[PDB]
Amino acid sequence: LYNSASFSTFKCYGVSPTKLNDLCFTNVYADSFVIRGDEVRQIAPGQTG
Amino acid sequence: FRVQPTESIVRFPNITNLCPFGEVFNATRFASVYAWNRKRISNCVADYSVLYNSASFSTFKCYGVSPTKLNDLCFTNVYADSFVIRGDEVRQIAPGQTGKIADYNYKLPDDFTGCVIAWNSNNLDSKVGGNYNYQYRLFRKSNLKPFERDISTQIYQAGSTPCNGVEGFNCYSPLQSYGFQPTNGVGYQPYRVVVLSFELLHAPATVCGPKKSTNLVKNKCVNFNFNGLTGTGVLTESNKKFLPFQQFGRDIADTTDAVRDPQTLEILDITPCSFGGVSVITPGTNTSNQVAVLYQN
Amino acid sequence: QCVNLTTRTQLPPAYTNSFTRGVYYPDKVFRSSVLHSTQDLFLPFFSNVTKRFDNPVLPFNDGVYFASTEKSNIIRGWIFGTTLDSKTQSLLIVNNATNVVIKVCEFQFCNDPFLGVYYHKNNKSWMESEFRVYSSANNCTFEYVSQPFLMDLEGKQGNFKNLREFVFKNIDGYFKIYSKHTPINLVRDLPQGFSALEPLVDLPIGINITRFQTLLALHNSSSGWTAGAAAYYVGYLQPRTFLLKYNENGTITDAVDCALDPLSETKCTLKSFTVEKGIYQTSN
Amino acid sequence: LVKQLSSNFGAISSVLNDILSRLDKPEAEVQIDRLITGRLQSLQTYVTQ
Ligand SMILES: *[C@@H]1O[C@H](CO)[C@@H](O)[C@H](O)[C@H]1NC(C)=O
Ligand SMILES: *[C@@H]1O[C@H](CO)[C@@H](O)[C@H](O)[C@H]1NC(C)=O
Ligand SMILES: *[C@@H]1O[C@H](CO)[C@@H](O)[C@H](O)[C@H]1NC(C)=O
Ligand SMILES: *[C@@H]1O[C@H](CO)[C@@H](O)[C@H](O)[C@H]1NC(C)=O
């Protein structure tokens, strides 16, 4: 899910994607939704607009 | 029984110069963390009690040495490292600290000895046509090794798709930002820090404190301070050949046993003051109250 | 003065194994009759020595240089950490009468054979001239000590007559150099004896050194670029421990390794240069 | 027993005067305690033997 022909857009916050293979978690939540085309800076914690 | 010292002998080099701290602190424009300014300091007198007492600092933190009495010691191989950072210095720049800066920008030793001096600068030209830039928040490989600095960073890849330049990657590793964002945000990133790295060893001092010296003695128990090295005993003339590059001696085990005077370059032997066990020779107290005393050896 | 010559003689390296030499003892004085262990990287007593003729290294900046030539063919200034770019800086040696300065700078000179060095018109063969150094102050710093140019041992006693030793350390942000020049009797190779070197400079210069070459270019004008039959020896330092013996002016008179021969190891563990009959556990 | 004085039993420096002249009071105390502990052990070992 990190680097392939698919999943062309990939961003991470809090936890680096280069460390995930060495990290364990619980109750992982998968949120599946559709975002409007104007998605520029629409997923950041520093959210305005 | 132990013989007490009669005089305190403090000896420092013939030097009357002054340490160029201001030349690093605020004489000109500041370099980025990656291109940090490495200034070698020598042949000068440094009064660090000024910076300790002075205002306009956010942090005055020492490692291996006290924030005080820094002016009582001589140091050698002294370097001043100047950086431009965010106010988030704590847990970023420190010995043993796995911060973003510590890992991929500027690495500080775990056994580091010296002082980290930092201050804010909200009264500068950064908000008035300022050209402040060169912020970094990306990685490369592993740690940079203590006190090392890169000069390249021209090509960066870290993963698959080895196209030697693809947009779907951690592009623009160098020069990540410049977002001073004047007046706005939790810290504008005006913070400057100077790290003073000191070596303390047998090697000749290059930086002295603001202390005057006194005279020497030849046949009496005294206290002494030779370039920060202290102790007590009788200082006598040596008859052994200490070569020009030799400042200190040593016995079969430890202890210098001799020093080279920083102003005359003469060698003095240090003999611990006389001492020995003290015992009372007595009859029973139910017979007599008169005793004799033996001072051993 | 770019020569880019191919008119040179190619001579294979020569090798020898007897090498009980190479000492850079600490400055702190150990009074006398002291048997003191030491750490750091030194040169093994029986290391395989290479005789070289301007052959590229790969010194790791940790090794020892020797010269056996006559003063008239004394090797001239050598450069450390040179790459084919302006990225690194190095310049260490000047003479006592050439009116030049040891100005450490980047290399922007003839590649590979930046000769430049000559001696004096009095030789009536080599042609008197000097180095052509073109440094740039733009994005370049300069740090040097111009004092250490008095390395000159005069006199014509002996049957060789003199030899020189220099050791260069990495070393952790410094470039420490130790050396000594001595008279010698008639020998065919490095003498089967012992001596020790003294420090010249500390040089608190933070430069990463990965390469090294020496230079001697006393080429005549009789034909092509032909110089005298000069040669030099080098070795490498390794992180081994040693036992040093002082006797009795605060100087080193003997030393023993730990890695070469179990007997030497035994001597070190017993803090002695003499071992009595018996069984000694030296390690595991 | 003499050589043990040079051991530096976890402290920043084997020399007591070096600690006293470099660190502050409570800062030195935590380093001195280490030298004392090691030296107490060295003496106790010597006497026991
Ligand atoms: C200090 O410098 C003066 C020369 O200014 C010299 O005569 C003297 O011997 C030096 N050392 C001492 C202890 O004064
Ligand atoms: C002290 O000496 C006297 C001598 O007559 C003796 O009677 C007495 O018991 C002694 N006392 C003690 C405590 O030894
Ligand atoms: C030194 O090592 C080389 C490695 O190729 C070897 O050929 C040579 O014979 C060795 N020299 C001596 C004197 O052992
Ligand atoms: C020590 O040096 C003196 C000269 O200062 C010399 O005469 C003496 O022989 C030397 N000692 C030894 C063991 O070489």
Short mmCIF file of C-alpha atoms in Angstrom, two decimals, chain C residues 85-188:
data_model
loop_
_atom_site.label_atom_id
_atom_site.label_comp_id
_atom_site.label_asym_id
_atom_site.label_seq_id
_atom_site.Cartn_x
_atom_site.Cartn_y
_atom_site.Cartn_z
CA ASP C 85 37.40 18.31 -7.57
CA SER C 86 37.54 21.48 -5.45
CA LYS C 87 35.69 19.74 -2.60
CA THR C 88 38.76 19.00 -0.44
CA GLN C 89 41.76 21.06 0.69
CA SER C 90 45.37 20.19 1.62
CA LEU C 91 48.92 21.61 1.54
CA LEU C 92 51.53 20.89 4.20
CA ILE C 93 55.16 21.51 3.25
CA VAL C 94 57.48 24.40 2.38
CA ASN C 95 61.26 24.79 2.40
CA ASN C 96 63.40 27.13 4.51
CA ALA C 97 64.48 29.23 1.53
CA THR C 98 61.82 29.18 -1.20
CA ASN C 99 59.75 32.12 0.07
CA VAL C 100 56.44 30.23 -0.04
CA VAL C 101 53.68 29.64 2.51
CA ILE C 102 51.94 26.45 3.62
CA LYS C 103 48.54 27.65 2.42
CA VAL C 104 46.00 24.84 2.63
CA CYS C 105 43.71 25.03 -0.36
CA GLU C 106 41.63 23.10 -2.87
CA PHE C 107 43.18 21.21 -5.76
CA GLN C 108 42.65 22.89 -9.13
CA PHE C 109 45.98 21.88 -10.61
CA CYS C 110 47.41 19.50 -13.21
CA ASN C 111 45.95 16.00 -13.01
CA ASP C 112 47.50 13.61 -12.32
CA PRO C 113 51.21 14.70 -12.17
CA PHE C 114 51.09 18.14 -10.62
CA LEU C 115 54.84 18.50 -10.38
CA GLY C 116 55.73 22.16 -9.86
CA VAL C 117 58.57 21.31 -7.47
CA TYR C 118 62.18 22.10 -8.37
CA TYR C 119 65.30 22.96 -6.39
CA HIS C 120 67.85 25.56 -7.48
CA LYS C 121 69.80 26.68 -10.56
CA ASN C 122 72.98 25.47 -8.80
CA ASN C 123 72.14 21.90 -9.86
CA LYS C 124 72.75 22.90 -13.50
CA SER C 125 70.27 20.30 -14.79
CA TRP C 126 66.78 20.41 -13.26
CA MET C 127 65.85 24.03 -14.10
CA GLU C 128 64.78 26.33 -11.26
CA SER C 129 61.04 26.97 -10.91
CA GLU C 130 58.10 26.66 -8.51
CA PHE C 131 54.55 25.39 -8.03
CA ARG C 132 51.61 26.87 -9.89
CA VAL C 133 48.83 27.07 -7.32
CA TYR C 134 45.51 28.64 -8.28
CA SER C 135 43.14 28.54 -5.32
CA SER C 136 39.78 30.31 -5.16
CA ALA C 137 38.62 32.15 -2.04
CA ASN C 138 35.02 31.84 -3.19
CA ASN C 139 33.38 29.18 -1.01
CA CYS C 140 36.76 28.10 0.36
CA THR C 141 38.36 28.36 3.80
CA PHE C 142 42.04 28.39 4.67
CA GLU C 143 43.78 27.07 7.81
CA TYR C 144 47.47 26.33 8.28
CA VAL C 145 50.63 26.48 10.37
CA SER C 146 53.65 27.94 8.55
CA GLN C 147 56.29 27.15 11.21
CA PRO C 148 57.32 23.44 10.68
CA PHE C 149 59.83 23.80 7.83
CA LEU C 150 62.99 23.20 9.88
CA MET C 151 63.08 19.44 9.32
CA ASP C 152 66.71 19.42 8.14
CA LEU C 153 69.42 17.08 9.46
CA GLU C 154 72.90 18.25 8.47
CA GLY C 155 76.17 16.30 8.54
CA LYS C 156 77.94 13.51 6.66
CA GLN C 157 78.70 10.90 9.31
CA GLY C 158 77.62 7.26 8.96
CA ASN C 159 77.50 4.81 6.05
CA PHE C 160 74.12 5.42 4.46
CA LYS C 161 74.04 8.12 5.87
CA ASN C 162 70.66 9.25 7.23
CA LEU C 163 67.03 8.11 7.24
CA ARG C 164 63.71 9.83 7.98
CA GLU C 165 60.43 8.69 9.54
CA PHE C 166 56.98 10.35 9.54
CA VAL C 167 53.65 9.11 10.91
CA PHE C 168 50.31 10.65 10.03
CA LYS C 169 47.12 10.14 12.07
CA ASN C 170 43.51 10.57 10.83
CA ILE C 171 42.60 11.89 13.50
CA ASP C 172 39.24 12.90 14.99
CA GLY C 173 39.31 16.48 13.63
CA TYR C 174 43.07 16.91 14.08
CA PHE C 175 46.03 16.05 11.89
CA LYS C 176 48.72 14.89 14.25
CA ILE C 177 52.20 14.34 12.85
CA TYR C 178 55.17 12.69 14.57
CA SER C 179 58.67 12.29 13.15
CA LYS C 180 62.39 11.88 13.66
CA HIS C 181 65.58 12.03 11.61
CA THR C 182 68.48 9.78 12.55
CA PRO C 183 72.06 8.82 11.51
CA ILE C 184 72.54 5.19 10.54
CA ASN C 185 75.32 2.69 9.90
CA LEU C 186 75.64 0.49 6.82
CA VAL C 187 72.33 -1.24 6.14
CA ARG C 188 70.55 -2.82 3.18
#
